[PDB]
Structures are given as C-alpha cells and as structure tokens.
C-alpha cells in the first residue's frame, strides 16, 4: 500500500504527510489521520469537510450548511483571519481573504488531516493543523466509470472517471475525473453549482522513475450561502418566543457568489540507486472569485449595532427582533507557486538503518483584491417576526440590492494587493535501531511578506526567519502496539499592524504529545490513541489601554485527549469511530481568559458501521449507518451565550448491481441527518450563528464499464 494511492480497505497504513516519506502509520510520531476514498464513496460527502465528520480532533461546522470553504478548526485551533489552511499533494493551496480554493472529493484519492505543529516539514502554519489530498492518479488496471446523482433541493450531479495506458506496459498512462453538479441551498434564494475536471498523465520510463502530471480546472457560477444569523432566531427565542426556520436566507435576493480555480503542476520521483531517491513537486495556479453578497450582522439591539441609526430609529423594545445588515462586493484573483524538491538519502550505521530527508521548499503567492464593503446602515434591516409558522411550510426569499453606487457615507473601498513568500529548507532523519523507531528533523523558514492598500498607499511588509523542529520515539513491538512520545513546534506570521505600524511578530506552537496506535499485522484494522498539551504562544490580544490596535504575548492551550478507529471486523463488516476531548484555553489574554475560544466543542464522537451481504436474497446489499456527536460550544469570545450539543445520524443503502451484469457497479441511497435534526452549527459571534444542514437524500447510480 503507497502512500500516494489506494489503501485496499478502509485502513490505510501508509501515510507520507507526516514524514514526507511513504512510512506506517505505527511508525510516525504524531496523529495522523486518513480518510480513503472508499469512505468518501459511501457517504457521498458534499465537500472534504464532510468527509471528514468521522475523524477526531476536527471541527466540520465552523459554518453549519454552508459549502463555500473546507475551513476547518483542528485541535481547536484555525489559521488567522478565517482563512484555509490546505494542502493538496504535499504542496499548500495558499489563499488569502475571500480567495480559498477547493478540491471536489471526487478527484482525491486520500484526504488526510495531520493533528499537531506541522512547520518541521511544511513551513508557516496555524497550531495543530493541516489537511492534506491526493489527487487521483492513473490506475493499474483500467477503469471506466460514469457517476449519477439526484437528490434533495433539486441536486443533480453527473460525473466521470476514467483511467487506462497507452501502451501495453504502462510507461504512458492517463486519468481524467470531471463532473458537473447542480443544486439548491439549504437557504432559500441560494444555489450551489460546480463543473470541475482533473487531467492527470503518468510517465514511467522504468521501475525507478515516475514523473505525474497533476491538474485541475474547476468553475463555479454560484457557490451559495455564506450570511450570518443572529444567535436570536436560531440558539436563542426572538421576543415573539418564535425561531428563524432553517431555511431561512436574510440575503439580497440578487446576493451572487462565484470562484474560478486553474492549476497545472507534478509530483516526481527518481530512483537513482540503493541509498538515493530524489522526489520533486511543483503546481503552480490561477484562482478567481467574485461576489455581490448581504450579509446579516446582528438584531438591532446586538451590541454590534450599538452606533446604528437606522437602529436607533426603533421603539427600545424592538430593536430585539429586526436585522441588521451589511454587505460586500468583492473581485479577487491570486496566483499561486509552489514547489518541494527533496534528497531521501537510505542508509546504515551498525545496525542504525537511516532514512535521511533533506530538501528545499519554496512558494509565492501573490492575491489582487478590489471590493467594497458596506458599513452600519448600508443596507435596509430585515423584520424577523414574519417568520412564523407559515414559514416552516418554507422559505420565501427577499428583495434585491443596489450593490452598485455604493454611497461614500454607509460603504467604502477596500482594494488590497498581498504578497507572500516562503522557502525553507529541512531536514529529518527516521532512525530505527530495531523495535526503537527514532525521528528527529528540523527546518528552517525565510517567512515574507508585502501588503499593498492601493488606498491608503501604504506598503506594509516583514521578512520572518524561523526554525522549527520535531523530535519522536516510536517502540514498534510486534504485536502490534506501537506506543509513541513527541515534540513539535510550529510558526504563523501575523498579517496584522501593530500601533507602531509594523507587522507583528509570528505566533508559535508548542506541543507535547504521546499515545498508542495499534496496527496489527494480520487483521485490516487500525487503532490509535493520544492525548496531548498544544500551546499557541504569542497571539494577538486587545491593548491594555483600548486603542483599536491589538498587542501581541496573548497565549492560548489546547490539551485533550483522541481516539480513533477504522477497520474491517468481517468480509462485511466495516467500522469508523473516534472520540475527542479538547480542553482549550486562554492563558494569558486582555479580555478573554479562561475562557474557551468559540466553536470549539468540548466533546466530540462518531461511530459508523456498514454490513454487506453476500448470503442469500439479499446478495450484494450493503446497509450502513451510524452517528456523529458535537457537544455544546461557546458562540462568542466573551462566552456570553453557549451552542447546544446535538446528535446527527446518517444512513446507507447499497445494492451491488452484479446480479444484472454489471459486477462492479451500483445503485445507492445516502441520507444524512436520518431525524432531520434542527441545530444551529455553531456561532463564532452573538450575530454570527449558523443553522446545521437539515436532512438530506441522494440517490447514486455509479457504473463502471
Ligand atoms: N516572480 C513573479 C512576481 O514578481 P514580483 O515582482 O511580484 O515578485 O510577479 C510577477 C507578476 O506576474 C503575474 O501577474 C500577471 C498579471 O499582472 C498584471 C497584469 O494584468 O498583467 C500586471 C501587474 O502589474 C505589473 C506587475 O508585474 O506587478 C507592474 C506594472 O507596472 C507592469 O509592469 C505590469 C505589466 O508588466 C504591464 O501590463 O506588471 C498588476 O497590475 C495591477 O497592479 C499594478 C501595480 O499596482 C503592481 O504593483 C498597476 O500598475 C496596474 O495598472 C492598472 O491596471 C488596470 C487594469 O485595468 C487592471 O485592472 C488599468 O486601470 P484602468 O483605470 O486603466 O482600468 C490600467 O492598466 C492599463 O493602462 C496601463 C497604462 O496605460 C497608459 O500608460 C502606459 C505607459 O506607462 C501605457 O503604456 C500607455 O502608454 C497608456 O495607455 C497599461 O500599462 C496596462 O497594461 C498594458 O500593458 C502593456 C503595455 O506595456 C500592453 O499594452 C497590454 O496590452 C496592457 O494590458 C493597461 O491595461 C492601470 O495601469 C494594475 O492595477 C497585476 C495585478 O496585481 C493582478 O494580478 O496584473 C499574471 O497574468 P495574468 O493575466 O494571469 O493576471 C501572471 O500570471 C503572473 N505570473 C511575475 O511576472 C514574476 O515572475
Ligand atoms: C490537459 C490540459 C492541460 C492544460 C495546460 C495549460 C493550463 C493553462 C492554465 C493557465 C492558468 C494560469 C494562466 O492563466 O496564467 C499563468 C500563465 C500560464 C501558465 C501555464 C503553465 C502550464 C503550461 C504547461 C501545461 C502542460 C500540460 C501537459 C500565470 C501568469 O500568466
Ligand atoms: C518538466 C516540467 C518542468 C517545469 C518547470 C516549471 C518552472 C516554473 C517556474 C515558475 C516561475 C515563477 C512562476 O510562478 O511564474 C508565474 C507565471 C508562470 C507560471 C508557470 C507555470 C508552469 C507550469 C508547468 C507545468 C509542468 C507540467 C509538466 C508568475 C506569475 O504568477
Ligand atoms: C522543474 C525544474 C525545477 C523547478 C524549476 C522552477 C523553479 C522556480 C523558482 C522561481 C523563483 C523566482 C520566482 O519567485 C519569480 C516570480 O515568479
Ligand atoms: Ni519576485
């Protein structure tokens, strides 16, 4: 099993995101989680967010329903500035503001998630966090596969997935994954469309060289809800003792939302003896988005809308039940470079067998953005009463925006030109002295920047250099059992300007972590466990003395314990579950202290099995289901309110088509929250809630040729 493909059942043992270098899973030092593309294949998962719903120490509903970004908390921990942080076949897909791209689930092979400092062999990144996927690549046998799906809010998708050679030995192999998919937003008003194809071709002149070109071009006209709601309609009763259904969208009716994503690239390797293999990737990409988008702040009598006229132009007792608003027009486009070349140097040293990395990585990524953003009373409020019961028999949608002609008085320009640039330079070393499993590694950053506000002409720029390193111990038994201790360290830049207008210093990560992970030889099953101590040093924190800038020294930690476990219980049993406790905290912080930053729940907890049949009647018929649970969370820094838990179930039905030919096809039946459960997501402020996603059918017809 390769790293870079396939996993054969749900467990994969193989994982280069940790070491970059195709190692056990037993054998790495940190958590380390992957989900398979067989997994994807059963829940049909939306997005790579949802195909993450069962792995531990991730957080899926940082925005409930909404699709538009695989934004993920890890370990309770974000990057800054509600941005991505995503790496797609070992090389970062750098976005900034509104422009974070996204990979289609179809086109993967793997997503994993690596839970811990992730600078030792990856540069400036948030605490405890990364995501990792793996383009598909031409297959070994040929495959011809054409997908159907029809579902819920009219979801229509229809898509392709074909991979063969050339010649009869292989040295020439393609793959090409597209699809088209076209649906309605949970909200009202709200469409989601998406037409993506990823060419691949491989060239393998012999068994030592294998270079693969990587590519990916995907469009997307609307990409559908993205507003916040008010903690009062969703969380909370409005005054009227009533809720905002679900469904509801307080968008302009002409609210648009699109992205353009085009990357070309490859992913090489060469063998050049016994002791030297040299691997190099390199993508380089084009991503666009746009959008005309009235966004809800919160109820009149929201703090936030304190300085609000058209607030303040409301009886005391109803500024409890209208809506504020806003809005923005934005237009980016950003290019994207990056490019990992690596020496993976193979040797002993009397019964010390090495495995020594040493490699360079380098990107830059340059973002244009033009937009406009529309301040207090900039946009007409929205009287919440109306949605009552006759509405729960829902929706209705809204009225349209002067987006153009943005008054100097409400709304101003906001035209931004970031740079970015990163090369670093690694390495790492996996020493096994039998039984004794030794990793150790550092790398070294040159972390630069350069903002340009094509407004204000100011040019802030700051030139980081950092060193990160990791040291750990895996003791591989033999029965399995491969208990395990590490250290880690990790750097995030500040893009923020202090008072002395300067760029502040990079905030740090400091994690200390041990745990066991089972990987028994025989059985196909995977189980593993930790329980570690993340501490975030140096975040930004409100200035002793108010003074609209922030001061740095804040400090956050993050300890909790993670278990997870993936196998193959039978011929026809499968079985994913894990649990995660996090306990995050402010340390030291102006205002917040103690408390636990919003959207990160305390508990966490999946379980999901599947049975197939291969008996009698009802041969080839798999039926699965299972559970995830979030617990309660904060909705707001100032822990003012709390996000209650909840419990969402989804279920599986899947009939081999065999038994009329087709062997190897399928017809199936997917739905997600079984009981329509009603929750709000969670909240990362008292205006900006987010109703989860209300129940869901899809039905697949997937048939291969
Ligand atoms: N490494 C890497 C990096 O480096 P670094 O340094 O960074 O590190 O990077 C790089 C880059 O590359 C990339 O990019 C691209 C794009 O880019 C652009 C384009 O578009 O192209 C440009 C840019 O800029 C620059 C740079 O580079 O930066 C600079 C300048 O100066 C120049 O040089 C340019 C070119 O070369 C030329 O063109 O480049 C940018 O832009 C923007 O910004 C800028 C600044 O700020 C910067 O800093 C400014 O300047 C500009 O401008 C403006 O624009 C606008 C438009 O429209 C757009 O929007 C306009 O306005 P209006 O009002 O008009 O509308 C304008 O424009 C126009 O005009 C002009 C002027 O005109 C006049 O004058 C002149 C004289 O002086 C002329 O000549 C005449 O006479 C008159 O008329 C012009 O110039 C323009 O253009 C033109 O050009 C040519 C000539 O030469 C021709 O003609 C053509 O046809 C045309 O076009 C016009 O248009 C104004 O001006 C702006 O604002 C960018 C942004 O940022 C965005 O991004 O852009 C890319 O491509 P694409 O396509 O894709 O995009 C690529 O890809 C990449 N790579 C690199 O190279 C390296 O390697
Ligand atoms: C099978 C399809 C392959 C398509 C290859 C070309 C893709 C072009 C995408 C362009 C997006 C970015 C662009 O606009 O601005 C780019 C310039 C184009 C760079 C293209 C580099 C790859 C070309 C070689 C491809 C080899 C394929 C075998 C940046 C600026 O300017
Ligand atoms: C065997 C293939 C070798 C490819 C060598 C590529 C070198 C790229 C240098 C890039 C310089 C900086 C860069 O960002 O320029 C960009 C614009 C050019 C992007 C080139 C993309 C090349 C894609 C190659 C695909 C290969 C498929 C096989 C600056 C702006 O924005
Ligand atoms: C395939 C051969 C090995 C990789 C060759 C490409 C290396 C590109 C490095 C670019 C650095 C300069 C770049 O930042 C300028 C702009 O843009
Ligand atoms: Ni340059």
Redesign the pocket.
Known sequence: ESAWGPAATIAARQSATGTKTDTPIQKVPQSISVVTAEEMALHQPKSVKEALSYTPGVSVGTRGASNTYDHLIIRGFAAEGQSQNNYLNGLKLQGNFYNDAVIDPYMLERAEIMRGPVSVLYGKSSPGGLLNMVSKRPTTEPLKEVQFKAGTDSLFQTGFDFSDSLDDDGVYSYRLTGLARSANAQQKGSEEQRYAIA?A?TWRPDDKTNFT?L?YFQNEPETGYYGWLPKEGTVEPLPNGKRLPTDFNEGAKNNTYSRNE?M?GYSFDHEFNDTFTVRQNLR?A?NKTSQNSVYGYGVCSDPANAYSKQCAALAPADKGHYLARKYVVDDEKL?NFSVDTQLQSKFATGDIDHTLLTGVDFMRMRNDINAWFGYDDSVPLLNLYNPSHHHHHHGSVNTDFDFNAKDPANSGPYRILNKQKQTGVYVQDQAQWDKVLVTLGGRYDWADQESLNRVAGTTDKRDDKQFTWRGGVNYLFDNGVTPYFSYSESFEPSSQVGKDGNIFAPSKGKQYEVGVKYVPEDRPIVVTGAVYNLTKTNNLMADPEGSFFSVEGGEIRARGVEIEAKAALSASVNVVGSYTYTDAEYTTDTTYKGNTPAQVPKHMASLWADYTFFDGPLSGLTLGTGGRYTGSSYGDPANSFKVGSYTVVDALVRYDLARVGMAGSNVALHVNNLFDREYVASCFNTYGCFWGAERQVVATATFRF
């Open positions: 060419p071709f070109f590519s085009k070309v380089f084009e290019q």
